[PDB]
Design a protein around this ligand. Structure first.
Ligand code: GX8
Ligand code: NA
Ligand code: NA
Ligand code: NA
Ligand code: NA
Ligand code: NA
Ligand code: NA
Ligand code: NA
Length: 285
């Protein structure tokens, strides 16, 4: 009975919600608010704990990019602060390898980072690792075969179809085949040994298209598109299906949650969030 957690987000201002969806019975839990509102963050899980990484607090009274790392324990319904990153990272990407959290890219003001740093929960410390070949904000991250992939984003000048691969044992990055479509703000995840990139913004339109990367054929292939165009959607995988949550469709902040079934190559609407929002962090535990 693992749950889909969605933390933070944006609607008129950065949000503090933590809510958890149960796909088996369709219920939503309202859990402890974040201590500081944040949008453009990422979520991940290590050791059954949920982590909220990076983002920004955009409020009527100011706009502050976040270096914060905060840890939610489902057993206690409590957020605890952790050591902060070396730099604020709004529109960050995150992946986990061997129980370590990798924070990639994101922005601080107009600085678009290529830097990458790694968090060790047992010692509550961050350390920089090799930087990406490309500056990327609004970047999607996938972990596959104990390699970390950074997909798409915005380099400060252009939205990107490029993607690159981090080798943790070697501490180095290499460019891989570029996507079919330029995507900033896509949801990026791993399902059945392929990397999926769904939605995003190509510099003109919000996208409903979805493409997936086969690391051996080194080819991106379109699959069925989502029912809603969305950028800055949340994304996760639960019991062999992709879930996308919220995002902005060009006009409204969506509450729609769609579900992709790889066996039938179809998307379905499965639930709604309790309010529309974009820029959430999402993880499963
Ligand atoms: C008013 O609406 C929104 C939508 C989302 C957010 S937000 O807080 O969640 N946030 C920023 C963050 O986190 O600081 C963000 C996320 C996603 C995006 N997008 C693009 C992407 O993904 O790179 S986009 O949704 O497709 C979009 C939204 C507005 C827009 O205006 C013309 C054009 C595109 C995004 O674009 C900003 C933008 C504005 C003008 C021109 C180009 C980009 C911003 C806030 C307000
Ligand atoms: Na809120
Ligand atoms: Na603020
Ligand atoms: Na419990
Ligand atoms: Na700085
Ligand atoms: Na920069
Ligand atoms: Na650790
Ligand atoms: Na290094």
């Amino acid at each position: 009975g693992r749950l889909i957690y969605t933390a933070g987000g944006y609607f008129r201002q950065s949000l503090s919600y933590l809510e958890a969806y149960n796909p088996s019975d369709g219920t939503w839990l309202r859990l402890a608010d974040l201590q500081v509102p944040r949008s453009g963050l990422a979520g991940c899980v290590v050791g059954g704990l949920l982590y909220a990484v990076g983002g920004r607090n955009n409020s009527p009274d100011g706009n502050t990019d976040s270096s914060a790392l905060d840890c939610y324990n489902p057993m206690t319904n409590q957020w605890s602060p952790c050591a902060p990153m070396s730099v604020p990272r709004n529109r960050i990407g995150v992946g986990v390898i061997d129980g370590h959290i990798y924070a990639v890219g994101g922005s601080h003001g107009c600085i678009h980072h290529n830097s990458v740093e790694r968090y060790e929960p047992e010692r509550d410390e961050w350390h920089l690792v090799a930087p990406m070949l490309t500056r990327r904000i609004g970047v999607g991250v996938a972990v596959l075969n104990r390699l970390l992939y950074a997909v798409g984003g915005f380099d400060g000048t252009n939205r990107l179809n490029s993607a690159e691969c981090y080798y943790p044992e070697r501490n180095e990055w290499r460019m891989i085949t570029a996507m079919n479509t330029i995507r900033s703000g896509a949801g990026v995840c791993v399902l059945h040994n392929c990397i999926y990139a769904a939605g995003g913004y190509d510099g003109q339109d919000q996208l409903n298209s979805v493409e997936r990367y086969d690391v051996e054929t080194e080819t991106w292939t379109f699959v069925a598109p989502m029912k809603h165009r969305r950028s800055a959607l949340g994304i996760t995988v639960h019991q062999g299906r992709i879930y996308v949550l919220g995002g902005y469709d060009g006009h409204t902040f969506l509450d729609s949650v769609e579900c992709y079934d790889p066996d039938t190559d179809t998307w379905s609407e499965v639930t709604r969030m309790t309010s529309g929002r974009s820029g959430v962090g999402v993880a499963v535990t």
